[PDB]
Amino acid sequence: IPTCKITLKETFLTSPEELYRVFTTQELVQAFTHAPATLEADRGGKFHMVDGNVSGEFTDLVPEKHIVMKWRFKSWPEGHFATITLTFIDKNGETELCMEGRGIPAPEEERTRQGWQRYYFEGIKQTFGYGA
Numbered sequence: 001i002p003t004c005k006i007t008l009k010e011t012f013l014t015s016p017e018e019l020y021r022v023f024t025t026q027e028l029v030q031a032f033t034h035a036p037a038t039l040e041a042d043r044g045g046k047f048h049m050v051d052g053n054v055s056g057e058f059t060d061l062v063p064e065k066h067i068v069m070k071w072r073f074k075s076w077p078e079g080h081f082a083t084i085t086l087t088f089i090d091k092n093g094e095t096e097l098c099m100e101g102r103g104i105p106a107p108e109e110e111r112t113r114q115g116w117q118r119y120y121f122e123g124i125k126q127t128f129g130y131g132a
């Protein structure tokens, strides 16, 4: 499988604590995805979202600071996971979120960029009121 790396950065009008909670609380994920979610907020914990179209495992969870996860869309080759790193930086009580995605199937680059930039980032901002 040819793969690609993406890097996204986005600033949210909330604190790192509140943004980290949004990414790691099953009921908050259900809210901004408009779908049932299962999320085990533990190192080794599994997550399943959006009718199983997104799933994976958390591999590193440092509250308010970073999340590392194995992450996939359901249509990817079975057992193929991207590694997604989320880093939370306090900038004047706003949060600069840095997303790095490695191991994304190359044909799926634009779908995955849209998934993070539009669905996660704009969905979180619209659901919780964290700025434009």
Ligand SMILES: CCc1oc2ccccc2c1C(=O)c1cc(Br)c(O)c(Br)c1
Binding pocket: 032, 033, 034, 050, 053, 054, 111, 112, 114, 115, 116, 119, 120, 123, 124
């Ligand atoms: C990236 C997964 C995802 O993140 C969200 C955040 C807020 C609202 C919906 C979603 C959402 C989806 O439903 C979804 C489902 C499919 Br299938 C996709 O091909 C894409 Br792309 C996105």
